[PDB]
């Protein structure tokens, strides 16, 4: 509805399912969510992990070529331009097939690409196989007011990348996933702690419903530095919309704990 | 009641009120509760932090001398000896006034103290001017047929002080705490995270009710590695017992993680 008192900043989460191997399909689906995005005032939208070509690991790396991927990233700078909102995507990244990344960036409104981050922390054996891990810490960067960030779904699970993040000022990390498996402590236990631990707020934007042999579970959440969902969604398909409004980060002795890990 | 059938570890938690500068009084319900844990079968009493003295910082700094915390010391291994329970305390480290800090111990069923830890993340400006930090990194420690290791009140909600003990092999990590102001995301929020996302049993005792000048939370818990509660208390003083019946530690890339904190 009307923008709040209280607020200056409201961001859109799509949760959907993408169709492996189908980008002409899921970036119409990305397009589709920006103009609603858009129309109901949001600044901004996180789409989820991977959404281009369907989370479809081994596919991707045996299937889609570094021109096809370069293809759905201009289409992806354009939405954001065409439809005037900041656009968080996700895919792999522009190198060969066997050197790439899944990584993550954001485009402002006018297009230009603000940051692109390579995720760090790879889940399993698909997608270590199908991909090759970042090796940078998570960019942080002004953006509507705050500091914004970027971490990529297995990532947020690992305090030490949310630390990373928060340590180079983060008070807003935006995260694509893809989460299947009924595995409910992620945005049940681990978010919530992320932000209360680091004092800011998350975004969590998933894939929901079959899709590649898995069944994702939605959940997609934005949480704020209390630990308290601002907003979410459940399993089916949406459009979230939330408008945003002794101390750890101090207090950590950083150079003992570098030692420990 | 009679000892299940999956599980060969039962622990005890004590939650009370202290009384400032009354060692004798404060020990003596230690020495309570060690009788009726054994009696109950547990074969480990977890006590809060700074419990002999009460939770009182700055008196602890001023009147309390080395020589009754030694005094304190010997009363409670005697008590872990002498009642025939793993006993595990908190009282100021062994030396002077201004160069000691906030201490942990362990002490096994025939008395001998297997193991001592100084709180590393000290919590307000009262805890940093009475108490010095501690350099050392949690220990671990085989104990009942699990590697249990001790971390102290504001300790925990770090996520760095639990990966230390999980990264030395941590199991069970025993948490003596002082927790007042109605906190409920320490216990409700961080516990289970750090449960979670090491794979790990935390268990927090706490003070309950009104001691120094504070209002203690109770919400004493021992928490599972699905970040689900085993046991738990509510604001009443009380003596919980438990039976204690991709992966994170070996995926986190720890060797760019301590650049990065």
């Known amino acids: 509805g009307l923008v709040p008192r209280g607020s ?6 799509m949760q959907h399912t993408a169709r492996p191997l189908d980008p002409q399909h899921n970036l119409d689906l990305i397009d589709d969510a920006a103009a609603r995005a858009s129309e109901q005032g949001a600044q901004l939208l996180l789409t989820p992990e991977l959404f281009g070509f369907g989370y479809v690991p081994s596919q991707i790396c045996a299937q889609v070529s ?8 201009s289409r992806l700078r354009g939405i954001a331009r065409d439809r005037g909102i900041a656009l968080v995507w996700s895919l792999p990244g522009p190198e060969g097939p066997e050197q790439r990344g899944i990584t993550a960036e954001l485009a402002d409104e006018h297009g230009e690409v603000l940051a692109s981050y390579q995720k760090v922390q790879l889940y399993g054996p698909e997608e270590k196989a199908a991909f090759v891990p970042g090796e940078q810490p998570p960019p942080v960067l002004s953006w ?7 971490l990529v779904a297995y990532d947020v699970e690992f305090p030490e990348m949310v630390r990373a ?23 049940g236990i681990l978010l919530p702690a992320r932000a209360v631990e680091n004092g800011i707020t998350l975004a969590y934007a998933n894939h929901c419903g079959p899709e590649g042999g898995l069944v994702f579970d939605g959940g997609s959440v934005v949480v704020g530095p209390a ?14 919309v939330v408008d945003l409004p002794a101390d750890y980060l101090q207090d950590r002795r950083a150079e003992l704990h570098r030692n420990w890990l």
């Open 165 to 187: 993040a928060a340590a180079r000022g983060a008070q807003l990390v935006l995260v694509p996933t893809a989460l299947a498996g009924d595995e409910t402590s992620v945005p």
């Open 144 to 150: 509507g007011g705050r500091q914004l960030s970027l």
């Open 66 to 73: 570094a021109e096809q991927v370069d293809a759905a990233r």
């Open 8 to 13: 200056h900043m409201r961001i859109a989460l």
């Open 227 to 240: 630990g308290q969902p601002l907003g979410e969604l459940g399993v089916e398909p949406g459009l979230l």
